Amino acid sequence: MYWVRRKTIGGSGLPYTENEILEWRKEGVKRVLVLPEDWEIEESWGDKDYYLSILKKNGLQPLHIPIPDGGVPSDSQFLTIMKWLLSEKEGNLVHSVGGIGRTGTILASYLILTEGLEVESAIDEVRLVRPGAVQTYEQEMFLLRVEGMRKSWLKNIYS
Numbered sequence: 001m002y003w004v005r006r007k008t009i010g011g012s013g014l015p016y017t018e019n020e021i022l023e024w025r026k027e028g029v030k031r032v033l034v035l036p037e038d039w040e041i042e043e044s045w046g047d048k049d050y051y052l053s054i055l056k057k058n059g060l061q062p063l064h065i066p067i068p069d070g071g072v073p074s075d076s077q078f079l080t081i082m083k084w085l086l087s088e089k090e091g092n093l094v095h096s097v098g099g100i101g102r103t104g105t106i107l108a109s110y111l112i113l114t115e116g117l118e119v120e121s122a123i124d125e126v127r128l129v130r131p132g133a134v135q136t137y138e139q140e141m142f143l144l145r146v147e148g149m150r151k152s153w154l155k156n157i158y159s
């Protein structure tokens with residue numbers, strides 16, 4: 001697991017055993033934005049809702065927002081993501097399956113709006129702790145679309 005900003009927002013792939021989830025809890029995680037797709041989760045645990053139940057079990061408030069592999073959040077989802085992340089600062093963990101593409105994208109989209117950084121730079125930061133962060137033209141297109149509305153993106157959020 002990795003921290004982008006120490007204890008405010010970090011990420012990882014999809015855990016396989018409970019311990020790994022207590023690894024999060026121990027490294028400082030408090031909340032969790034689950035990014036995998038239903039089937040992606042269950043192929044690992046056997047039951048999506050069961051996984052979300054243990055997430056809540058260890059406290060961690062789980063917000064499940066599905067994002068297909070190599071894809072990007074939908075305008076609504078994203079705003080729904082920020083409202084979530086930008087409303088608890090401490091302990092955020094964004095995870096998908098590999099914790100490289102979809103997670104890298106979301107973290108970067110966070111930095112872009114929080115630290116007002118351009119894409120290639122936000123990416124550069126995330127790849128600093130998460131090597132190879134962001135893997136599809138789709139995601140790059142998004143981040144760009146984001147950076148081009150860091151204005152409304154925030155007005156939308158902090159409304």
Ligand SMILES: O=[N+]([O-])c1ccc(OP(=O)(O)O)cc1
Binds near residue numbers: 096100102
């Ligand atoms: O190995 N995999 O099956 C796999 C690896 C990475 C994936 O996507 P990510 O979590 O956005 O990096 C999705 C699936």
